[PDB]
Design an enzyme around this catalytic site. Structure first.
Site, PDB file in Angstrom:
ATOM      1  CG  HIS A  46       3.812  -0.461  -4.216  1.00 38.13           C
ATOM      2  ND1 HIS A  46       2.622  -0.746  -4.851  1.00 38.13           N
ATOM      3  CD2 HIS A  46       4.557  -1.590  -4.159  1.00 38.13           C
ATOM      4  CE1 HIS A  46       2.695  -2.019  -5.197  1.00 38.13           C
ATOM      5  NE2 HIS A  46       3.848  -2.565  -4.814  1.00 38.13           N
ATOM      6  CG  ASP A  97       0.294   1.632  -4.972  1.00 38.07           C
ATOM      7  OD1 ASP A  97       0.227   0.434  -4.632  1.00 38.07           O
ATOM      8  OD2 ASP A  97       1.368   2.200  -5.276  1.00 38.07           O
ATOM      9  N   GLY A 196       5.205  -8.933  -7.376  1.00 37.36           N
ATOM     10  CA  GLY A 196       5.791  -8.829  -8.709  1.00 37.36           C
ATOM     11  C   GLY A 196       4.777  -8.456  -9.773  1.00 37.36           C
ATOM     12  CB  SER A 198       3.022  -4.413  -7.593  1.00 38.03           C
ATOM     13  OG  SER A 198       2.597  -5.015  -6.381  1.00 38.03           O
TER      14      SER A 198
HETATM   15  N1  LIG Z   1      -3.146 -10.602  -2.874  1.00 42.21           N
HETATM   16  C1  LIG Z   1      -2.715  -9.908  -3.928  1.00 42.21           C
HETATM   17  N2  LIG Z   1      -3.415  -9.985  -5.055  1.00 42.21           N
HETATM   18  C2  LIG Z   1      -1.541  -9.142  -3.865  1.00 42.21           C
HETATM   19  C3  LIG Z   1      -1.403  -7.974  -4.633  1.00 42.21           C
HETATM   20  C4  LIG Z   1      -0.226  -7.220  -4.583  1.00 42.21           C
HETATM   21  C5  LIG Z   1       0.824  -7.629  -3.753  1.00 42.21           C
HETATM   22  C6  LIG Z   1       2.000  -6.873  -3.685  1.00 42.21           C
HETATM   23  C7  LIG Z   1       3.047  -7.292  -2.856  1.00 42.21           C
HETATM   24  C8  LIG Z   1       2.919  -8.455  -2.087  1.00 42.21           C
HETATM   25  C9  LIG Z   1       1.744  -9.209  -2.146  1.00 42.21           C
HETATM   26  C10 LIG Z   1       0.697  -8.798  -2.981  1.00 42.21           C
HETATM   27  C11 LIG Z   1      -0.481  -9.550  -3.044  1.00 42.21           C
END
Ligand SMILES: N=C(N)c1ccc2ccccc2c1
Length: 246
Positions: A46, A97, A196, A198
């Protein structure tokens, strides 16, 4: 990373900082990554699906800050950007992912292991830690959901693994979270991974060995009640990782 503590790359030597070259010359942070072998970095699809051009990306190892050339750091280009063929993104859930980045220096060499640059061991088949096990996450992601900027210094925190049956509850994610996904959060919902973070690592210490159990994938908001962080279960993708790195 919401809450937690500020850290340096010596505590997380497997962490990879991935950036993108924009048309014009500007460079921005994209996602986190993990060094599994000197030539390979593992992340999330992603992070790259909308811009699948391998020439656009810059990969750093041994980098402690977002805009600082940390002593002992190594800069790389993406020789091969491999994205999972069956990747898809629903309203919340992100399927398959997982992405592999073959890294190469301008001299054509892979990562040179040092004190600040090390690999993270892959987990073994059908051997993941039980629910309630404390695991660490690392990234340059948002400190607060309302923030638009990313923290300058690298951050880390500790989250506990949540069982599939608990994460499948109606107030949690229901049937949207699958057995190929792993849930992890703070029981008090104060600390979590965010936008961020991710592609970043979810490292669990299992049977005395530190292993790459998860990859930051998705979640409803950041550090929200009954909304855990959802991570790509690396143990399932072991035949895919092996075949695409051979
Ligand atoms: N709640 C999370 N740990 C989490 C993980 C990945 C994400 C990726 C993009 C936007 C929010 C996110 C929240």
């Amino acid at each position: 990373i919401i809450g937690g503590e500020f850290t340096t790359i010596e505590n997380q030597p497997w962490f990879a900082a991935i950036y993108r070259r924009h048309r014009g010359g500007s460079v921005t942070y994209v996602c986190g990554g993990s060094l599994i072998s000197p030539c390979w970095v593992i992340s999330a699809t992603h992070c790259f699906i909308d811009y699948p051009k391998k020439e656009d990306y810059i990969v750093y190892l041994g980098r402690s800050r977002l805009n600082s050339n940390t002593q002992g750091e190594m800069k790389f280009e993406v020789e091969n950007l491999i994205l999972h063929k069956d990747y898809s993104a629903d309203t919340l859930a992100h399927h398959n992912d997982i992405a592999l980045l073959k890294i190469r220096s301008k001299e054509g060499r892979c990562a040179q292991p040092s004190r600040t640059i090390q690999t993270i061991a892959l987990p073994s088949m059908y051997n993941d830690p039980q629910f309630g096990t404390s695991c660490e996450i690392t990234g340059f992601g948002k400190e607060q959901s309302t923030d638009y900027l990313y923290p300058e210094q690298l951050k880390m925190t500790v989250v506990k693994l949540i069982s599939h049956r608990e994460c499948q509850q109606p107030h949690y994610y229901g049937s949207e979270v699958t057995t190929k996904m792993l849930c992890a959060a703070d029981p008090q919902w104060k600390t979590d991974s965010c936008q961020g973070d991710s592609g970043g690592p979810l490292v669990c210490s299992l049977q005395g060995r530190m292993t790459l159990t998860g990859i930051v994938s998705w979640g409803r908001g950041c550090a929200l009640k009954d909304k855990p962080g959802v991570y790509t279960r690396v143990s399932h993708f072991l035949p895919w990782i092996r075949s695409h790195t051979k």
